[PDB]
Amino acid sequence: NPALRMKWMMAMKYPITADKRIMEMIPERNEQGQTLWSKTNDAGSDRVMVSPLAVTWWNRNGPTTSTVHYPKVYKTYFEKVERLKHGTFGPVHFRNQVYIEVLHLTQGTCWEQMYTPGG
Amino acid sequence: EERFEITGTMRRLADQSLPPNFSSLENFRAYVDGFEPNGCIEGKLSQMSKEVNARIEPFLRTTPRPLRLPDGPPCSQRSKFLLMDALALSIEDPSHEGEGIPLYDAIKCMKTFFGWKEPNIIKPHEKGINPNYLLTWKQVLAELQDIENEEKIPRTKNMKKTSQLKWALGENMAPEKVDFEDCKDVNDLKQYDSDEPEPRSLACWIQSEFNKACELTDSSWVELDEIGEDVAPIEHIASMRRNYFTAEVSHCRATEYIMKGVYINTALLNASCAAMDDFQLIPMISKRRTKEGRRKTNLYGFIIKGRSHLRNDTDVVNFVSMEFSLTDPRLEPHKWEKYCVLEIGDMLLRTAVGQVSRPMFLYVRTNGTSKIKMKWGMEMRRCLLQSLQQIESMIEAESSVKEKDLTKEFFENKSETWPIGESPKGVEEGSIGKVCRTLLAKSVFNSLYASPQLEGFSAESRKLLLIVQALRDNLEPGTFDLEGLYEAIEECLINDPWVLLNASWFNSFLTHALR
Amino acid sequence: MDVNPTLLFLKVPVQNAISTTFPYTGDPPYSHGTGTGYTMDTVNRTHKYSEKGKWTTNTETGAPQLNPIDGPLPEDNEPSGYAQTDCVLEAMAFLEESHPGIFENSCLETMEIVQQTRVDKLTQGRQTYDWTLNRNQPAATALANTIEVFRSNGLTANESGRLIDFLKDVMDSMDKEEMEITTKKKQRLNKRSYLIRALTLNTMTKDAERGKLKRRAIATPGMQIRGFVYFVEALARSICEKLEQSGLPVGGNEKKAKLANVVRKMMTNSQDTELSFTITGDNTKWNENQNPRMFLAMITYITRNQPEWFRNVLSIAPIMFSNKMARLGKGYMFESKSMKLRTQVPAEMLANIDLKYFNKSTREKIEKIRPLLIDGTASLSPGMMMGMFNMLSTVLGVSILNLGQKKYTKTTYWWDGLQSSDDFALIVNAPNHEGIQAGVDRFYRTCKLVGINMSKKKSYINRTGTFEFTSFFYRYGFVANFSMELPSFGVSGINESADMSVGVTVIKNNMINNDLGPATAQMALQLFIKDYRYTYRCHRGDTQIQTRRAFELKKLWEQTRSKAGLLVSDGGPNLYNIRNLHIPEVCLKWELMDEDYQGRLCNPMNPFVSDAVATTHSWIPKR
RNA sequence: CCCUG
RNA sequence: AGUAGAAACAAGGG
Ligand SMILES: [Mg+2]
Incomplete structure (x- = not known):
């Protein structure tokens, strides 16, 4: 069972594996003294062991780059959220039993929800 | 283009896979090609005897009869932990630690009691060596006190492999493995004993257990996260249903059972998988929030886990469990067949009558569990889920007939009471909250007392339920063979007390329905 | 007062509260030991129902075989296996007549798929039986070894x-004189040994099964039979797709439509003085009464007027299945209590061994099955052990159902219904009760003529309007679905970003197919959120729970301006709901993140990296 | 003493 | 002892 395996793996100190250049960007110790990475090398490769505290440190302390391109390449996903935001809902009708994408919310076992997408 | 020729060996194989009185595959294909249907089925039906028929036996109000239950000594409790007799030593931890060491919590909970005394055995175990249990309890106390005399405080306590722990955890009981050539000439060489379970009759304690499982407490045992804001009306209705159910069911005892079992199984699995060749000690701890919103931590007892060299998903790991309680064992002794009970302390409670000095007993038992049972017990929370669905389904069904949701007519109406119990004066009707608690208790107990007999009984009794319902609907029911169904239903009532209770419930419902 | 949930049925009908009769929250039963006893019992029972057949000896493999086809007609209500060829062929002919052109179109589609298919399809499957190592291996490994x-x-x-x-x-290898295998070591097998190996099934007990008390034995085939079976199943599926009564291979959205359609067809046309009744019932010993010779006859009739190569490739599979062998299994275990010993007896020695060790039942089974053993396996010519032909049997049942039209019956009564492998439901219309009884008897007798047996213990008849079909409970137009077990909505255990999408998709798919309600979906979402947070330790930012990541999460929460844009992995709030279960998380809050925070989150030069969106959270854990 | 769950 | 139920665990190999 992978679920319990990862439950146990996350309890260790450095369950993540990263490259060697990480040592040049983020420091070995937090502002409180917590360790972020260790000198030990991975078996079979030159990777190093890293802790999730390194991930959080990078997210809150690290280089910034413009992400203008992201919406362009992931256009299909953003179109969905736009349509959902600009849609209009309606009353629920309990009766015997662009639209298919939201099929899990419109139809049901014995009820119908009125929906017209905002696009 | 395409060339697929049957060779000699395949031709010789296919020449023998034809109906009788046919010679070769080519002859069979020729016969099938030129076949035209004429009066074959009608003839064969004519030659058939008249004993092959399906007569329909009418079903009437006087036809069905109550099920038959087995006989023998009464059934005994067979759960991994006490349910109705549990007692907990409670403290407060205002520093909210996400996951701390439980040993220190156990010690801190222990240090709040000042009434210990010399233990003795009052209800013994007939088929076991009693003094070993007492020695085990004293050993655990001694180890807890030894924890103080150490340069550094440890996180886990590995018990010394003593004689009493060697016996209690069944050490060196497996026979020796050899080959068949050496030991062929032995007088007593056979295969294992493949017999059937020994029958037992129903007892009155399981009904009380279920009744107390459907009651309210003064604490909150479940805390759930948040979801987004509800914009669609369907989401408004869904949130209303969910919030009403959660409010009605969050103070129930079944939630306490769920959390207790989840914690115990998680601890057992982690200990078994980590320390394979050590006799680990694992306490039983739970967390609650009082009526004032103030946290509390409860301790129930201890377990000691032996060697855990598990290979398959059915290999067994043994352990010894000690629990606190106040239930005098000498009131329903047949319920405690496999327990050894000691009187270890004297507690004092405070109520309207003033202060009363009650005794405090300890239940000690050797048990075992597999990897699959522990894996399936770590996720008791789904019981809640199941219960909700049941309730919701009812409303959904009741809506389709009238083409209108009836959530408010079900929950807030404060009327429309459902017949949920039984009383000497007659059937008893309860509100919706009682119904929700009853369904949650049923799901929890289904998870606690799982067994193949329960599955068989449910599957084979569903059909009788539906037949009776059709009869109550004046649809003129009829059965091709009714006695076989009764035999199949009754073949599954052997040992489990839960299945016997369900059978008794079915008998009572059958009596009341046809009246 | 004594609580009693069963009494709840005194107010709400049973079909409205059927979910209370499913104990699907405990651990399902498992089996400890060997599946040899069940295998021998199954073989003996399969040979019992055909005791009045023809016995012969096989010239190639040398094992005895039994053939009950065209045997004496049944007399009593016990299960029978004597299927008449004439009746089967007549039923097939009438089915073809009722739906002209079905077989030709099915043959054309099957020929197309045969031309197009590829070997790689053999890689997708369950654990197959590898004859190079004489064991059970995954499909890919067994295919590689065989090639x-x-x-x-x-x-x-x-x-x-x-x-x-x-x-x-x-x-071609079947015709080879000798077969050499590598083990470094080498081994040689002559014609008979290789042939027996190629016609062998591996049997074992079936674990984690609900609704039954006693265990069962199921079998898996080798590698030389998989392709022919796949072609036959393709043909059967193509045939079934065009049949209205067939319950396969549809999902869970049109099955309710099928039930309502059947009921309305058998009710609306009825006059005001016509009686209608419904039978819900099962079939007994379905797998132990279907002779592969009848399947060969059906395949021969289906593929009339076709190229010879197509006929041969399609008809090979019944030939192999009619000459199959069953492996007894692991063996038995012996225990000496006096001297405290245990030993294992492999199945190979069951043929020649004293019977003083075994108990009564096992000794009787060994004695009964002894004449069949050859080279450590048992010949099982009659019956289908594991029923890989899950769709041809449905075609046969549907043909029998069709056989009851108003034209063929030639009497006042008539009937029609639904069939799906083992399960079936029937509706009979007649002017009196005598007509109803006559129709029921005619259906039962006609079924018996082909080898299909109706179970009289699990079947009942009532007035039409309410019934059941494959756990779909129909009552006055309302259908409830309970044929699927609810999963545990937990963490898959891959990454911080994979688990979120996986869990949300699982919830959405359960909501769509298995008819999960809204409130249950919300509660499942809450439980999964709790599990995810407690697994990855990414609690909220304002929550006062102490953890190793608490300091970093609190600092990040304090830094940000809009707290609603933080991912759940960075101690943000929860925004998902029923209407949002299809939008990936990163794209869900993109218009709510800060400039610098969202710049750092999707940094492409971060050391951690190298439905989902690439971010800083897609890392690879240690082995 | 080593290896394996 | 105990788990468990038609056959097994209650450690196996060198
Ligand atoms: Mg059915």
Whole structure:
């Protein structure tokens, strides 16, 4: 069972594996003294062991780059959220039993929800 | 283009896979090609005897009869932990630690009691060596006190492999493995004993257990996260249903059972998988929030886990469990067949009558569990889920007939009471909250007392339920063979007390329905 | 007062509260030990129902075989296996007549798929039986071993990468005089040994099964039979797709439509003085009464007027299945209590061994099955052990159902219904109760003529309007679905970003197919959120729970301006709901993140990296 | 003493 | 002892 395996793996100190250049960007110790990475090398490769505290440190302390391109390449996903935001809902009708994408919310076992997408 | 020729060996194989009185595959294909249907089925039906028929036996109000239950000594409790007799030593931890060491919590909970005394055995175990249990309890106390005399405080306590722990955890009981050539000439060489379970009759304690499982407490045992804001009306209705159910069911005892079992199984699995060749000690701890919103931590007892060299998903790991309680064992002794009970302390409670000095007993038992049972017990929370669905389904069904949701007519109406119990004066009707608690208790107990007999009984009794319902609907029911169904239903009532209770419930419902 | 949930049925009908009769929250039963006892019992029972057949000896494999086809007609209500060829062929002819052109179109589609298919399809499957190592292996490994062993000897007709070429190689190897295998060690098997190995099934007990008290034995085939079976199943599926009464291979959205359609068809046309009744029932010993010879006859009739190669490739599979062998299994275990010993007895020695060790039942089984054993396996010519032909039997049942039209019955009563492998439901219309009884008897007797047996213990008849079909409970137009077990909505255990999408998709799919309600979906979402947070330790930012990541999460929460844009992995709030279960998380809050925070989150030069969106959270854990 | 769950 | 139920665990190999 992978679920319990990862439950146990996350309890260790450095369950993540990263490259060697990480040592040049983020420091070995937090502002409180917590360790972020260790000198030990991975078996079979030159990777190093890293802790999730390194991930959080990078997210809150690290280089910034413009992400203008992201919406362009992931256009299909953003179109969905736009349509959902600009849609209009309606009353629920309990009766015997662009639209298919939201099929899990419109139809049901014995009820119908009125929906017209905002696009 | 395409060339697929049957060779000699395949031709010789296919020449023998034809109906009788046919010679070769080519002859069979020729016969099938030129076949035209004429009066074959009608003839064969004519030659058939008249004993092959399906007569329909009418079903009437006087036809069905109550099920038959087995006989023998009464059934005994067979759960991994006490349910109705549990007692907990409670403290407060205002520093909210996400996951701390439980040993220190156990010690801190222990240090709040000042009434210990010399233990003795009052209800013994007939088929076991009693003094070993007492020695085990004293050993655990001694180890807890030894924890103080150490340069550094440890996180886990590995018990010394003593004689009493060697016996209690069944050490060196497996026979020796050899080959068949050496030991062929032995007088007593056979295969294992493949017999059937020994029958037992129903007892009155399981009904009380279920009744107390459907009651309210003064604490909150479940805390759930948040979801987004509800914009669609369907989401408004869904949130209303969910919030009403959660409010009605969050103070129930079944939630306490769920959390207790989840914690115990998680601890057992982690200990078994980590320390394979050590006799680990694992306490039983739970967390609650009082009526004032103030946290509390409860301790129930201890377990000691032996060697855990598990290979398959059915290999067994043994352990010894000690629990606190106040239930005098000498009131329903047949319920405690496999327990050894000691009187270890004297507690004092405070109520309207003033202060009363009650005794405090300890239940000690050797048990075992597999990897699959522990894996399936770590996720008791789904019981809640199941219960909700049941309730919701009812409303959904009741809506389709009238083409209108009836959530408010079900929950807030404060009327429309459902017949949920039984009383000497007659059937008893309860509100919706009682119904929700009853369904949650049923799901929890289904998870606690799982067994193949329960599955068989449910599957084979569903059909009788539906037949009776059709009869109550004046649809003129009829059965091709009714006695076989009764035999199949009754073949599954052997040992489990839960299945016997369900059978008794079915008998009572059958009596009341046809009246 | 004594609580009693069963009494709840005194107010709400049973079909409204059927979910209370499913104990699907405990651990399902498992089996400890060997599946040899069940295998021997199954073989003996399969040979019991056909005791009045023809006995013969096989010239190639040398094992005895039994053939009950065209045997004496049944007399009593016990299960029977004597299927008449004339009746089966007549039923097939009438089914073809009722739906003109079905077989021709099915044959054309099957020929197309045969031409197009590829060998790689054999890789997708369950654990197959590997004859190179005499064990059970995953499909890919067994296929690789078999192809390597084939190439060891001169066999290079399957290099073209077509499944039919692989089957040609298999057939050629069957005719080879000797077979050499590598183990470094080498071994040689003569014609008979290889042939017996190629016609062998591996049997074992079935675990984690609900609704039954006693265990069962199921079998898996080798590698030389998989392709022919796949072709036959393709043909059967193509045939079934065009049949209105067939319950396969549809999902869970149109089954309710099928039930309502059948009921309305058998009610609306009825006059005001016509009686209608419904039978809900099962079939007994479905797998132990279907002779592969009848399947061969059906396949021969289906593929009339076709190229010879197509007929041969389609009809090979019944030939192999009619000459199959069953492996007894692991063996038995012996215990000496006096001297405290345990030992294992492999099945190979069951043929020649004293019977003083075993108890009554096992000794009787051994004595009964002894004449069949050959080279450590038992011949099982009659019956289908594991029923890989899950769709041809449905076609046969549907033909029998069709056989009851108003034209063929030639009497006042008539009937029609639904069939899905083992399960069936029937509706009979007649002017009196005598007509109803006559129709029921006619259906039962006609079914018996083909080898289909109706279970009288699990079947009942009532007035039409309410019934059940494959756990779909129909009552006055309302259908409830309970044929699927609810999963545990937990963490998959891959990454911080994979688990979120996986769990949300699982919830959405359960909501769509298995008819999960809204409130249950919300509660499942809450439980999964709790599990995710407690697994990855990414609690909220304002929550006062102490953890190793608490300091970093609190600092990040304090830094940000809009707290609603933080991912759940960075101690943000929860925004998902029923209407949002299809939008990926990163794209869900993109218009709510800060400039610098969202710049750092999707940094492409971060050391951690190298439905989902790439971010800083897609890392690879240690082995 | 080593290896394996 | 105990788990468990038609056959097994209650450690196996060198
Ligand atoms: Mg059915």
